[PDB]
Every structure is written in structure tokens, then in C-alpha cells.
Amino acid sequence: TATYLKSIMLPETGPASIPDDITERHILKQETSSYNLEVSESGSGILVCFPGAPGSRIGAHYRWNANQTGLEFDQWLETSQDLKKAFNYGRLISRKYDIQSSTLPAGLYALNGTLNAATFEGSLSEVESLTYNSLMSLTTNPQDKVNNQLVTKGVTVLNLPTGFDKPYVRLEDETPQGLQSMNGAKMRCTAAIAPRRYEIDLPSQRLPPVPATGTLTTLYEGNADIVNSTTVTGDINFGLARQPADETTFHFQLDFMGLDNDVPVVTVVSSALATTDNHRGVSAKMTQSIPTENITKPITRVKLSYKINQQTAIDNVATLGTMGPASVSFSSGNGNVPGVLRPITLVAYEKMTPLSILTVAGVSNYELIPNPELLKNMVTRYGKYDPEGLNYAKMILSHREELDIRTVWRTEEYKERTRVFN
Amino acid sequence: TATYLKSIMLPETGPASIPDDITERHILKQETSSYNLEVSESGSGILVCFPGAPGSRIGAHYRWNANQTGLEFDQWLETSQDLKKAFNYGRLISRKYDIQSSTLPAGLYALNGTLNAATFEGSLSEVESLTYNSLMSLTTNPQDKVNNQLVTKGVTVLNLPTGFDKPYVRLEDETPQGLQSMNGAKMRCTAAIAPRRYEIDLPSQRLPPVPATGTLTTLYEGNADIVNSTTVTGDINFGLARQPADETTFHFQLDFMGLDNDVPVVTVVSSALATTDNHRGVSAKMTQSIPTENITKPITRVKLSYKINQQTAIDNVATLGTMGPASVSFSSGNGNVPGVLRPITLVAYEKMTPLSILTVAGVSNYELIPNPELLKNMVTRYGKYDPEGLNYAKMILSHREELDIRTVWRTEEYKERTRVFN
Amino acid sequence: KATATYLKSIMLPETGPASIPDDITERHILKQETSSYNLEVSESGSGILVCFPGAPGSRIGAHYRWNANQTGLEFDQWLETSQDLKKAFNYGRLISRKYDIQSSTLPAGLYALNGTLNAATFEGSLSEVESLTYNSLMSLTTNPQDKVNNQLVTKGVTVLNLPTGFDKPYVRLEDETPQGLQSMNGAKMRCTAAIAPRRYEIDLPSQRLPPVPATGTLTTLYEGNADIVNSTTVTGDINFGLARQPADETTFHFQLDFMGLDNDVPVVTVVSSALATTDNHRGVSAKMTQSIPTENITKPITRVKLSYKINQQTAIDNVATLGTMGPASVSFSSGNGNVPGVLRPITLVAYEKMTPLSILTVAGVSNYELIPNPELLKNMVTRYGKYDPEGLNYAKMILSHREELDIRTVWRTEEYKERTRVFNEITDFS
Amino acid sequence: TATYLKSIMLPETGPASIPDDITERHILKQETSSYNLEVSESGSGILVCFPGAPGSRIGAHYRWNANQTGLEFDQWLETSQDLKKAFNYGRLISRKYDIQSSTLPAGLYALNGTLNAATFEGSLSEVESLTYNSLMSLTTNPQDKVNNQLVTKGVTVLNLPTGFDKPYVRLEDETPQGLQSMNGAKMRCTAAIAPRRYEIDLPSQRLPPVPATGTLTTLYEGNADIVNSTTVTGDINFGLARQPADETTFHFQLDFMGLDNDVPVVTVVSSALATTDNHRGVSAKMTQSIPTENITKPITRVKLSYKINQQTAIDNVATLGTMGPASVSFSSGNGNVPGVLRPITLVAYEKMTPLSILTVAGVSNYELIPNPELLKNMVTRYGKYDPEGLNYAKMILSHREELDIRTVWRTEEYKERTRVFNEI
């Protein structure tokens, strides 16, 4: 008994079936991650942990440039194997990170570098400043924060479950295909189980005047965050004042960006054509679908903008909404599943010794469902019937202030404070 | 212990956390709502209650016209605070309404009025007639109806949970927008979790003829309820019979109306064009996205139309369904979340004294999740760990008939039968 | 008690004044000034009473009434004292205040009248209220001692004033100064209130000005919420550089009109002009050096709208980016608005659905310690306080224990009337 | 009782409400800072502290260039949370910094660095020489200095109050704005309570001749310090000696700088067309308003310059004061509030190995008044009513010298010498 709470508290002692009502025929599997990140020239950076995200991507790694004016995206933090090549559905029992430098000092003093870590029950886009200083100002729970820990003593980022009846989620696997496919066109059973919808929702005023032809004047830019395949559904209707002398195109842009620099991860264009016939209602439909492989890095910003090609019609005010709401939306995968996009843990290091080694070390315990190619050889069973295992975890989570269990640790307060679940 | 049932029966005794499986870090907040409703000169009107809606709108009010020929929308019933300005996610614990008049104007001797209240497991597009005598047939459950109740004694509308593992729902809040937006564009993380889709499915026969140019003849009209943002998908495709002599437009309409009058709440237009080339493959696509702020009143009817702009094209039958099924879909928000749009509680008052006042006092109990601005200055924790208490609140929901645990009460029998729950 | 004389003036402001026993010790004059209003309820049967509890002065509140169809409000009148203080005095603090709002129609039969009354104390400035609505003002505070909802309009509500701070300064009262016989006809200098101002800055960004639709059509630049209640000075400038030198002389009006919270006709507007010419087309500064007397502030100001317009039909494509000759902003500082009590905190009393043509009575009372003007300074003796050492210290523990003692800024007038007798009103016989 | 002096003495033990006369409903909130400053190649620098500033900017950091001829602004130091976004008014209760190195870079096996510190009472622009060993000659109070302290042991800076009835200060936050705002404009409720005003007072003699057209001659250069929103008022009025053959503009600058390097932090402009009619009464109005996001780094200098745009106008002497005193004033925020702009505490470091880390750890305590959105959900209340409260705190400040209560400590002395104050 109580072999599921022990797997939450100690995620490296192996997986265990979530003893809840969503009982399927699954596979218990533990997957690890091992990185040796080379500290950049400014010795500073931030690594975003998604501790409850069921999948292969468990984190991202950004690093400050020399002047610490901006960040650069180093790489994702995946697991050992890409789970979608042998599994179609998956959950997450447990996860644990060990962010800790591996540079043993010879002398009696430590090398220079510290760690701030905060569990922010929001999303990456909702953070206003990503900086080692302004991380304590993301929560107020004393169990979600750790400040000024030596980088050679390390922080353990536990994952405390956010809900207990989470659904098995598609892993973006690939379907069989024929031999007459194009060359590299594939098809995926992507994630769509509880989407996260956004909507730019422009008002019914005139379009801003563009300074020149083909200059891409901005219409809106906000903070929406995206991790996997999205569908863009909307339209941008507008009526011109006077019928155009020539015919104008009205290019619309909608590019997506990251939190580090203004080079668009994905851009998605729609076009119109203002003609003498339809000069009173023109519509540019956004019906584009964005696969999950074009998202090379996390997305935290969108920007909608437009440009016109005709030299004239630069004074053709073109009021919006002449055929309806004039709104553009997009929906994304499993954004609104507890664990994806929310919550997140931020671990930031400052002034680590230039060209030294930070070693992240992750452990995940999944509940997976093999793909048909693997059912031939893998036996799939049910949960092991723990009747009390979830009440015990609910009791542990409800008293996390007296017992001082926490999402983020000091790795030595952790290594010492959890040997009672053995 | 047994403190979650107390918050169901006595929504005024404050909120208690749901002991179900979804365990988050939340905020227990109570909201009140108090309205003094002017009664029209007819005296009749009708209230709509959404006793399970987790949002910030808890009902609507319609007032019959001078001779009960039609209704008119009065206003939305909502809570005191606008939850979507300080919170992101939320789910409802319990709610309670209290109706009465019990007061009359300066010099008057006659106080007359009666109440019919019945809980309906439909969605208010399902109701056929909202008249005072009608809505006693909306259910055949004994403990869901109250008829011929004196307006001075009033009805208390309770809320019984239709399910327990409800998900937290995005409250349609604005996202942090950068500069360079145009003037008033704004993006909201709308609701997507468990939507409600309506397929139109026009049959692939001849398009009915227009009597004249630009007169908007009907293609379909029906009942479908929408309260939050929605996205419209599909396309009407059709091939002309011979060939267009000159270019025609085929302007499609798709208006949305409420139950009171026939002025559309919001209209989404899509305009095709039949040229000589595509004269057998004309297609009018629907991609519009309706923000949840264009829904001013409860939408209950949908009507699709079309019209042409050329005289020569009254003939040229223009058969549907050449390129595909020629259908039109639209999905909305949390339509299929149990609590939104289901169930409804109708409360009909009948011939109150003209120019008298009806009193609606509601108290909701939510479990909210703050927004990043509020996370820094507010502690968010887990539930109180009632191990039982869900079973204790589910035994009552099953023995409700031998316990007479009602959804609609007479205020005087409620105010004394529920004192057993401390 | 020998002590508890100052506290007795806060809890029972009807029983006359009592000098504030703080460190601001001047030779002053104790005065009690009363307010009385019988308000004619309008056909909407609804309205709002914006109280100003800690406001030292004559104006102690405002009365707004909803229009017929309950869409927007209308400004009835200022709620002030019976006699004008600034005629006889020069300086003043406020010791305590109390408002009593009540329906004086009082039905004859067995059923009460249809009128209900909401009241909440908001630690804001009447521009920080997103919406004034009978339902909307029950979530303005979580403090249970600042909220009363669903009070029957005949039983009434009491709005007690609790001091926020104790070393408040003596503020000038906008008395007008002596003048020679050569003034034109209506000029008058006033010693206006300027001690601890509240400042706003509109802060335009340094980029292209929005395009104007036509000539003289007043394009909007900014509109937000900034409450002003007395005299103010506008200080700023707007500068811009034209794309290319103009074909003619463009004027570029700027409007900056202040607006109340009820209708969009400006309470006061003030215009500046910058004539862009051939030579100085690269920098065109519109100086904003304005001073609005409190005599122009007719009703409470809650919103602002900065707008502009050009007069040449040409030059309508001269994009005119801002910020050339510096930050390109405009500012206006108003009176003594950061003095605690002025503009914050305020109390809102909403009456909803009363009988039209019924009567709503309002009976204020305000104890001041004032300083006479020279005219009656030759007849009144001004002296120091009463020397109660523990007077302030006794009131400090009352405010700190106001939860367990249940000391409220908003009452039901039957729990106020019955719960304020421990503060002596009982005449212990000799 | 005695629970407020404990907060002044040991700020790390949490905030406590001030027992003074300013009694308003408020929120007690403790905010931390954490900084790892990078020592440059000169191994030197200076770390300014604003121990009593109720805002969010609690200090700047400077470095000395290679040959120590001048400084360079590195960065502001500031609380983790941006207070203005969730609060309108605030008062500071306590604030303690903490400075050390205690660690070493890659290829180093010996650490070295010494550390001067002194509690000034001017305003960061009244100091004349700001070198490592000159800031010892800025005070004579033994309780306000520490000399040649090893950087590995550390200097603690403590905030002893200067006054007790400080008002709640506006935190410069946003106001609600409706639609129709142009693109990115924004109105803020800035600080104005107790301003600080300078005036440049030019004499009514002739303007100094300009060398060439458009060459920016200098009229005044001096030391004034600004940290927030500033209004400029005044005018320069002059009369040309004779008829101007061609109209001149007379560009007047008045730009502001920091102490690091003479690049303008904020520059302003005013022009005065001298035409043939008003050549007896030309005047250049100055009516600008400088918001607080333009003050990117501390300002400690102003320069008022001018220039002409015509060739013939280099003669025609243009004497000042023809229509009045001809001065240019500017009043800034709430400079004269005790705690803002004074007292300053400077901590200088030198002889440190380049690329080593200088750790700063601040912890502040505030009384804050939540903004309307946060006000709807959090409850505000009054002080905790300690009647004596201040007399105990006021007693220690008077017995400062015999009890040795310092603003600038050395850490090992601070850690143990102040354990006395652990009692509730």
C-alpha cells in the first residue's frame, strides 16, 4: 500500500499506477533525462521546467547574452527516447529535476554562482520579467520558492500532482501511409483533448495607415503561449471608403514569436483583394493549421500586422467589421490540461563561472499505451488496485504547510527530508 | 467533516472546497448578487437561472409585453465582482437565489402576484413555450417544481451538483498586450474546454429562388443557444446551372437572434462570387470568430439566409453540393460542460402589481485561481481534505426523494427544512 | 470620562466638536456645521450618493440620479454644508462627520415601500470605480465593517467617518483676497488649496500622431480616469516634427477637456495652439500653461480626453511624429489631493428603485477646527486645545480593534443608534 | 510591544506596522532583493544605497573604467516585485542590505578585496569626489563609517529612520483608460507630495557669444539630482541689440546627465523665433513634463545650453532679463521627503580580482495600500496598537553612540551585536 505517494515524493524509485477512476490498460515506464549544459559567456541563464507536462519535452533552456539585455534559446530538454515512436497515449505519474553544478572545487571556497527557483502557477507568457531577481515575486507560498542557493548544492524541482483524473493524451505519433505520398508529407494523430483558445478580437475602427507599400504595419501584439500544433480560425473583414483605383491585396501576417528575440518561429499569411466589385466588404480568411514540428522553441508572443501593395489606396481608410466581428482566433492542443503550460517552475542561475557545467538530471514515471506495432509484443495490464493510495496523497497534499513538502527544494533539505517514504 | 454538503444546502454559510479528484491551488471566494427588478405594466415577465454556470453571469430577465404577445430582454443577472478581471480559472461550489416582492409603492392597497418555478434539464432553446401555465410540464420530477406560490412568500432556487469532477474553466480574461497595438485590439484566453457544436447540413438540392435582388431569402432557421465566444466553420458550395451573364455575389447571412425579438444579436456574413470560370464550383466559406462580448443577450435562435445582387441571376438555379456536403458548423465554449446551459431553472412571476419591484438575491461560492498580478500577493493552497464528504454529499443526492431535497423551494419551507444542516 | 472626549466626537459627531489631540497644535476655533437635504426621487427611482467623509471643506458629497432607462447617471447637485466656510474662515481641518440617509415617506399600511439601499466605503478616488451600480458596489471592499447591503430605505443608513491618519494639516479654504477698486468687474484672486497635490501625467509616446479624419474634427489622443475636485494647473507641452515643410500655415489645436462620470459634455475644456510654419516645421511645441479655478469645476471630474485637430485641408498627410523637442507629455496637478481624506477614501450610498416622487432625507453634520479670517478675527478668541494626553492614544486602540468591537464606517441606523451609548449620552445624575 | 524596533533592527524578521500618528488601513509586505554584481577589470567600483526610499529602486551600481578616470552605470538595484503594479501608496518600514564575495572564479586560488562604506546625508550629487578613499571624508559619526573591511567578511547597511511621520507616497502607477487612446499613451498618478525645486537664475547680462551657427554654447552647468517625474517651468527672455536682418530661433537645451558620463539622460528643447517686431522681447518658454520612465539612471548634473540658426545674429548681443528675471525652474516629484534622495549610503570596493562576484542581498518592509483590483479581494486593516511603540524605538536612536547602533555595520559585528533584539 501507499506505493503511489512514494512514487510522487520519490520519483526515481520507479513508477506506480495512479489509483484513480481513469483506469485503462497501460504500461508503467520510467524515463530519465541527463544534460550537461555549458554555461554561456555571461554565466547566467534560465531553464523553464514543465514538471507536469506529459510527454517528451519537459523543459526549455534559455541563456542571457553578454550584456544580459536579452535571452537566447539554447535547446529543449527532452527525455532519452522520443516516446511518440513507440507509444500513442500517455499520462504522468511523477517527475523530478536535479539542477546542480558538477565542478568540484579543490580549495575551501565555493565557485561563484547561485540559483533562484519559483513554482509559478501560471504560464510562461504570463511572466512579466524573467530575471534571477524578479522570481521571488512570482508566488508567495514559502514552499514554492528557493532563493540564493549555491549552484554546487543544487535544487530539486519536484512535481506535485495538479488533479488526479487526468486523461490519457495523444503523443503526436505518426500514422501509416501509402507509397504515393509526396516526398516527406506525413500525418499525425495530434493532441486535441482540452484546447486553449485565444482571440485577437479587433475593434470596428479604421485600419491604421501604413507608411508605405509593403511595410507591414502592426495591428496587435500580445502574450499567448503555445507548445504544440495549433489551428488558426478567423477572418479579417473590412470595407474601403471609395472603390480602389487599382486593385489592392492587403497582405495579413500573424507571426508567432518567442520570449528571447523577435525572429518569428512561425509566420502565417493570408491575403485579400480589394476590387471595384467588393470594395465594400473584403475578407481575408485565416484558416491555417500549424503543425507541431514548426514550433522549434516555445512561443510566448503573437503579432498581427498587414501591408498593402498599391501605391495609391494608401489613403483609403478601410474601416473594419463591415461584415461582422472582425476577429482572429487560434486553438491549441491540450493547453487547458493541468500540467501542460501550467504550472511551471523557473530555475535561474546567475554569474556561474564562465564555461563551467550545469547538470540537469530528470526522472519521469509515465503511464503509456503502446502503438499497434508494439502491442504484438508488450502485455498491457490494469492498475494494481490501491484503494487508499489516492486518499493518502490527498492528505499529504492538503497538509503541505505543517509537513513542509514542497514543489522546489535545496536537494539536501530534500535528500534528508524525504526518507520517510521508504 | 460533512462540510461540503453544508455549503450545498446553505450557500450563504460560506464556501467549502470540493473534495473531488481535481485538486488545485485555489481561492475560496463568496460572491453576492442583489437586484431590484422593475415589473412592466403587464406584470408578467420571466427569469432564467443558470444555477451551475461557473462564470460571472448567473441568469437573465425577460419581461412580457403589454398583452403577452412577446417577451423583451431586460438585463443579465450577474455577480458583484467581475471575476475575469482578477482570476483566470474557476469552478462553482454552490449557488442560491431568493425571489420575493413583499413591498409596494407609496400609496397602494393591493399586492398581488404568484410564482411558477421549475428546473429544466434542457438548454432554453429546448423550451417550446415560456408562458406561466406552460412551464409546469417542463419536468415530471416532484422536487423540481413549485406552482402557485404567493409572490410575498417567494421561491428559493437551489443548485444541486450535476457531477463532481468538473474542470476549472478559463474566465475569458484579457492577456498582457504589448505596445504598438492599434488602438483597442485585445486578446482573451477564451473558453475551449468542452464545446458544443451545431451542424446545419443543408441538403444538396436546388437553392430556393429569390423574389428580387438583395432581398435575403431564408435557407434555414432553428434553435441553438450560445452564451460565450464561438467560432463558425463550414462552407456553402454550389454550381450555377448555365453560366453567369455578369458577375454575381451570392451574399450569405447567418444571423443569430434571441428569444425576445427578431433583431439579430450578431451577424456573420460570407460573400462568394460566381464567375464564368468557377460557375460550377462556387464556394462561400464560413470562418468567422465571434467574441463573447458581442453576445449581449442570450442567443436562442439561428437563421441562415442568402441573396444575390444581379438581376439576370434570378434563374440559373444554382444547385448546392457540388464540391462537398455544403454544410455550416459552429462550436462554442463550454457548451457541453455540465452546469453551463444545463440545467435551466425558469421562474415565472404572473401579474404582479404594475410598477412593483421584484427582488433577486443570490449568493455564489466559487473556487477561483488568481491571475499573475494576484498570485504575488495572495496565498493559494489545496483543499481541506474531507476524505468522506463526497460520499456524504452523494448519499443525499440519491435519497433526495425520501428526503425531499429540492432544486426549487418555497422560501418558507427552505428557510426551515435546511436548518438541520447546522 | 476625563479622557475619551475626542473619541466621543468621532463616534457621536452630533454631540459637538472636540479638538484633535495630535501634534499639530495651533490656535483654532471649534465649529459644528450641519447639512440638510430633502431629495426629490426621480422617475427612475434610483441614484447614488458619493460621500466624501474625510473631506475638509464645504463640499461633502455629490448626488447622482439614473436616467429613465437606467443607462447613465446625471449630476443633481453638490452636497455641501449649510453655510459657506470660505466666507468666514481661511484654514481648517475636519474632526468628524456623519451622514444620515433615510426615506421620509413612511408608508401607512402593512407593507414597506419599494426602496433598498446599498452602502460601501471604498479606499479609492471615484475614478477607480469601474462601474457605479447598485449591485456593483457590494464588491468594493472585503471589510465587513464597510459594507451594508439590502437595507430597507425607511430604516436608513448612517455613514460614520473614521480618521485615516492623525497629523493632517490645516488646509486653505479658497477664500478670496482683498482687492483694489480697479478690477474690471469680476476678477478675484483666491488663496487656493495647494499643500500636498495629486499629480497626473498623460505621457504621449514618441511616434506618429494618429491621422485626422477631416479638417477640424478633433481626433482623440488619450482618454483615461483622473479625478479632480478643486483648482488645478495644467503644465506640459506637445511637440512634433512634420514629415515635409507645409504648403500652408497649419494650426494644430489641442483640446484636453475634463469630463465628469455621468455625461460626456466637458465640465471644463482648455485649448492650446501651435502654428507650424515653413521654418520650424521640424519642431512645433504647443505649450500648456493653464490654471483652472475651482469655480469652473461645477461637478466632480472623473475622466479626461486629450484631443487635437488641424485647420488646413492640405497637410492632412504630414505624419507628424512626436517627441522631437523632448518627452512630449502634459501634466496637471490638482489642489491638495494627496491629503488623506480628500478624494480618498470615499463612501458610496446607492438607493435603488424607490418610489418616484418620494423623498430622501440627508442630514449631515461636520465638526471642524477652523481659523477665522481677519474680518472676524477681531472678535473671536482663538486658543489651543484641551490637553488630553491619552485622547489620541485611546482612539488609536479603537481603530485597531474595530473588528472585535465592530466599529463601522457604514451602519444600519438602528444598530448605530442603539450601539452608540457606551460613548456617554446617558447623563449620570449628580 | 517592542515589536517595531525589532523590525528596524532585524529587518529579516518580518515587517511590523509603524506606531506613529499616520494611521491608515494598509497591508504589511516584505520584499527581497538578490544581486550578483560583476567586478570589472579595474577591480573597483561603488554601490549606492537609498536606505529609506519607499519606492522600488533601492540603489545603483557603478564601476570604474580601466584607468579609473570615470565611472559607468551598471544597473539599478531594485526589489523583486514591482510595487506600483499592485499598490497605490506605500511607506518603508525597514531595509537591510548585505554585501560579500565569499566565492572565487575559475582560475583563481586566492581571494582579495577591501570595502569602504559611509552613510552620507546629502543627495548623491552633493559629493564632489566619489573615490574609494574619499568617502571616508564625508562623515564624522563613528556609527556611520567602516574602513578597509575585507570583502569576504562583508558590510551590512541598516536603515535607521529619519523622521517618523512620513506620509504614504504615490507609487507612480497606471490609471484606467478607455478606448480611443492613440497607440500607447498612458496616464500615471505620479508623486508630488513634498517636491524638490531647483532654479537656475541667470543674470541679466548679455548672452555669451556663440562661436558658429548651431554650435550649442553653454550657459550653466551644475549639480542637481533627480530620480522621478519632473516638471520644468520658467523662461529665458532677452532683447536683441538691434534689428535682426533675418529671423533667428535661439535653440535652448537644458539637458540632464548622470555622474558617469556626459551623455544626456533626458534632453528638452525650447525655441524662440526672434522676428523683427519682437526683437525687444524675445522669450523661450519652458513648460515640459518629464515622466519617470525617462530617468533610466540617476541624474546628478544639468547643463543649460543654447545656439542660433542664423549667421548674422552672432553679433546683436541679445542681453537677458528684458521682460523679467529670466530663470528656469524645475520641481521633481517628492524629493524633499526624508528618505527619498537623502540620506545616501555609499559602499565602495577595490582591489578585487576582475570577473569576481559581489553579492548584494536586500530585504525591505513596507506598509502598502492595495490598488482597486487587489483591494476587492484582500482585506486592509489598521495598525496593531502598540501604545509605547515609538518611545522605545525613539529611545535607542538617541542612545545611538553609547549603545553603538550603526547604520553601516560590518557583518560579523552585526550578526552577534544585535542578537539582543530577539524578544517579542
Neighbours of B246 (CB within 10 A): 12
At how many Å resolution was this determined? 2.8
Which chain B residues touch C150 with a CB distance below 8 Å?
34, 361
| CA dihedral angle for residue D8, residue D9, residue D15, residue D18, rounded to 10 degrees | -30
Chain B partners within 8 Å of A141 (Cβ):
25, 379-381
CA distance A211 to chain C (A): 9
Using a CB-CB cut-off of 8 Å, the residues of chain C touching D180 are 220, 223
Which grid coordinates are listed for D324? 523679467
Q: Which residues contact C166 (CB under 8 A, 6 or more apart)?
A: C20, C22, C392, C396, D21, D22, D23
Residues 6+ apart with CB under 8 A from C289: C234, C235, D285, D287
Question: Any CB–CB contact under 8 A between A380 and chain D?
Answer: no
Contact B82 C109 (CB under 8 A): no
Are the C-beta atoms of D12 and D424 separated by less than 8 Å? no
Cα–Cα distance, C136 to C48 (Å, whole number): 12
**CB-CB contact of B288 with B231 (8 Å):** yes
Amino acid symbol at C30: L
String of DSSP letters for A234-276:
EEEEEE-SS--SS-B--EE--EEE-SS-SS-SEE--B---B-S
Q: Which of A220, A253, A344 to mutate to test the interface with B (most CBs of B within 10 A)?
A: A220
Q: Given an 8 Å threshold on Cβ–Cβ distance, is A211 in contact with C317?
A: no
Interface of D with B in 178-237 (CB under 8 A): 179-184
The separation between CA B277 and the C-alpha centre of its own chain, rounded to angstroms, equals: 45
Name the β-bridge partners of D118.
D145, D346
Peptide bond preceding A343: is omega within 30 degrees of 0, i.e. cis?
yes
Considering only CA atoms, which of B310, B333, B142 is closest in space to residue B227? B333
Q: How far is B85 from C136, CA to CA, in rounded Å?
A: 14
* Phi, psi of B179, rounded to the nearest 5 degrees: -75, -170
Q: Name the closest residue on chain B to residue A118, using Cα atoms.
A: B376
Taking contacts as CB-CB distances below 8 angstroms, the residues of chain D near B370 are: 377
Please answer yes or no on whether B31 and C139 come within 8 Å at the CB atom: yes
Q: What is the DSSP letter of D372?
A: H
Residue type, A307: K
The span from the CA of C274 to the CA of B100, in Å, is 62
- What are phi and psi for residue C56, nearest 5 degrees? -80, 115
Residues of chain D positioned with their CB less than 8 A from the CB of C239: 269
Terminal-to-terminal C-alpha distance of chain A = 12
- Breaks, C-N > 2.5 A, in chain D lie after none
Report the gap between the CA of A349 and the closest CA in chain D (Å): 10
Cβ–Cβ below 8 Å for D375 and C123: yes
**Which residue from C115, C135, C355 is facing B35, i.e. has the nearest CB?**
C135
Q: Nearest Cβ partner of C138 from B78, B80, B101?
A: B80
- Read off the C-alpha cell for D273: 523665433
Query: Could you tell me if C141 lies within 8 Å of chain D, comparing CB atoms?
Result: yes
Residues of A in contact with C319 (CB under 8 A): 211
Nearest C-alpha of chain C: how many angstroms from D91? 13
Q: Which of D32, D33, D357 sits opposite A112 (nearest CB)?
A: D357
H/E stretch holding D256 reads strand D255-257
* Number of neighbours of residue A251 by Cβ within 10 angstroms: 17
Chain A residue nearest residue D32, CA to CA: A136
Q: C293 and chain D: CB distance < 8 Å anywhere? A: no
Q: What was the experiment behind these coordinates?
A: cryo-EM
C105 CB-near residues (< 8 Å, 6+ apart) = B106, C113, C154, C355, C358, C359
Distance from CA of D395 to the nearest CA of A (A): 35
Residue with cell 460570407: B270
> Which class for D276: exposed (0-12), middle (13-18), buried (19 or more C-beta within 10 A)?
exposed
Please check whether residue B27 touches D, CB under 8 A. Answer: yes
D26 sits in which H/E element: none
**What torsion, rounded to 10 degrees, do the Cα atoms B256, B257, B259, B260 define?**
170
Minimal C-alpha gap between C211 and chain A (Å) = 8
Residue recorded with cell 552585526 = D414
- C150 interfacial to chain D (CB closer than 8 Å): no
Spell out which residues of chain A touch residue D78, defining contact as CB-CB under 8 Å.
133
CB B162 within 8 A of CB B106: no
Query: Is residue C238 within 8 Å of residue D289, measured between CB atoms?
Result: no
SS3 D21: coil
Contact with chain C for residue B78, Cβ under 8 A:
yes
Task: For residue C110, give every residue at least 6 positions away whose Cβ sits within 8 Å of its Cβ, in sequence order, or none.
Answer: none
Question: Can you give the C-alpha Rg of chain D in angstroms?
Answer: 25
Does residue A15 have a cis peptide bond before it, meaning omega lies within 30 degrees of 0? no
Q: What number of H helices and E strands is found in chain A?
A: 4, 26
3-state secondary structure C288-346: EEEEECCCCCCCCEEEEEEEEECCCCCCCCCCCEECCCCCCEEEEEECCCCCCCCCCCE
Q: Which residue of D has its CA nearest to A67?
A: D74
Cell numbers that stand for D168 in this block: 504614504
The residue of chain D with its CA nearest to that of B29 is: D377
C243 touches chain A (CB under 8 A): no
- D81 contacts in A (CB within 8 Å)? 134, 136-137
Structural contact between residues C99 and C159, judged by C-beta atoms closer than 8 angstroms: yes
| CA D360 – CA D348 distance, rounded (Å) | 13
Q: Could you say which of C114, C135, C205 has the minimum Cβ distance to residue B104?
A: C114
Cβ–Cβ < 8 Å for A421, A96: no
Q: In what order do the strands lie in the sheet with B145-150?
A: B73-78, B57-62, B46-49, B344-350, B114-120, B145-150
d(CA C239, CA C272): 12
Q: Is B173 on the interface with A (CB under 8 A)?
A: no
Residue A138: closest C-alpha in chain D: D81
Residue D105 near residue D36, CB atoms below 8 Å: no
| Dihedral sign computed on CA atoms, order A80, A83, A84, A90 | negative
Task: Determine the Cα–Cα distance for residues D411 and D419; give it in Å rounded to an integer.
Answer: 12
Q: Is A137 in contact with D31 (Cβ distance < 8 A)?
A: yes
Residue B374 near chain C (CB below 8 Å)? no
Name which of A196, A283, A398 is nearest B383 (Cβ-Cβ): A398
| Distances in whole angstroms, Cα of residue D330 to Cα of each of B17, D186, D219, D227, D289 | 57, 22, 16, 13, 9
Question: Are D29 and B374 an interchain contact pair (Cβ–Cβ within 8 Å)?
Answer: no
| C319 in contact with A, Cβ within 8 Å | yes
Q: Do A203 and D179 touch (CB under 8 A)?
A: yes
Cα D306 from Cα D303, distance rounded (Å)? 10
- Is B377 within 8 Å of D378 when comparing Cβ atoms? yes
Closest-approach residue (CA) in chain D for B184? D179
Cβ contacts of D102 on chain A, cutoff 8 Å: 109-110
> Is the peptide bond between B343 and the residue preceding it cis, with omega within 30 degrees of 0?
yes
B-D CB pairs within 8 A amount to 41
What is d(CA A137, CA C190) in angstroms, rounded to the nearest whole number?
48
Contacting residues of D for A116, CB less than 8 Å apart: 34
